[PDB]
Design a protein around this ligand. Structure first.
Ligand SMILES: Cc1cccc2c(-c3ccccc3)c(C(=O)O)[nH]c12
Ligand SMILES: O=C(O)c1ccc(Oc2cccc(O)c2)cc1
Ligand SMILES: O=C(O)c1ccc(Oc2cccc(O)c2)cc1
Length: 212
């Protein structure tokens, strides 16, 4: 597409998109065009408003576009074109990407004892309520665990809430511990978001005993 400002909007929060260059109050010559999961290509929104779109997105007195509660389907493109009193045209281009933060990740079913030199089921990590899906990853004593690499095996499952569309992730970790290692290793699980710049939420660690 065109040069745009990337906007990250949280599901359920309001969103205000600013229409640069517009007069501060009516009378205003401005037009909003949006292309989202709600639209068939471009939909035009005007200060006068009206119709079903008034329940979803409406032009504010200052010309900004307001969404009371952003949903998954509001991902797409939002553009404004406005003329100031003189007549210079100004354009505003926004790429809106939506997200939701899951609840804290939880280690359900953990092993209290591992046996060295054999593959062991360590635990299952569960994360509920993310958008987009995101990923679950495992850590040993603070260091990332890489699947397949020398005794680590991870299997994963992604489920979708039938009405909200939010994702639930579940990850199972198996390790083949090496003879002569830490007999009380510390495993943790963490959620990594899809959209850039978000923090990693981590689980309480689990400290099993390793038998040589
Ligand atoms: C590249 C770019 C960035 C920001 C806005 C626009 C508009 C537009 C938006 C609302 C009303 C009229 C025109 C157009 C077009 O459709 O020509 N291109 C744009
Ligand atoms: O009534 C009018 O004259 C009028 C009303 C709205 C309006 O939106 C636009 C449409 C295109 C470009 C632009 O910069 C602003 C343009 C003109
Ligand atoms: O769904 C609704 O009822 C709804 C949603 C948004 C909304 O913002 C506006 C927009 C323009 C003028 C104004 O005074 C308030 C107004 C009503």
């Amino acid at each position: 597409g065109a040069m745009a400002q990337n906007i990250t909007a949280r599901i359920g929060e309001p969103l205000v998109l600013k229409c640069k260059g517009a007069p501060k109050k009516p009378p205003q010559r401005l037009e909003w065009k949006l292309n989202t999961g709600r639209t068939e290509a471009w939909k035009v929104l005007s200060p006068q408003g009206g119709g079903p779109w008034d329940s979803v997105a409406r032009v504010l007195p200052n010309g900004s576009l307001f969404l009371p509660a952003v949903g998954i389907q509001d991902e797409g493109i939002f553009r404004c074109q406005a003329m100031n009193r003189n007549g210079k045209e100004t354009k505003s281009n926004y790429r809106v990407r939506v997200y939701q933060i899951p609840g804290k990740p939880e280690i359900v079913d953990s092993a209290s004892e591992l046996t060295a030199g054999v593959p062991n089921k360590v635990g299952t990590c569960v994360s509920e309520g993310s958008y987009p899906a995101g990923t679950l990853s495992w850590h040993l004593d603070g260091k990332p665990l890489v699947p397949n690499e020398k005794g680590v095996s991870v299997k994963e499952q992604t489920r979708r809430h039938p009405e909200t569309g939010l994702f639930t992730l579940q990850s199972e970790l198996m390790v083949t511990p090496a003879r002569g290692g830490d007999p009380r290793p510390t495993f943790s699980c963490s959620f990594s978001p899809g959209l850039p710049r978000h923090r990693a939420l981590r689980t309480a660690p689990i400290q099993p005993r390793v038998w040589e």
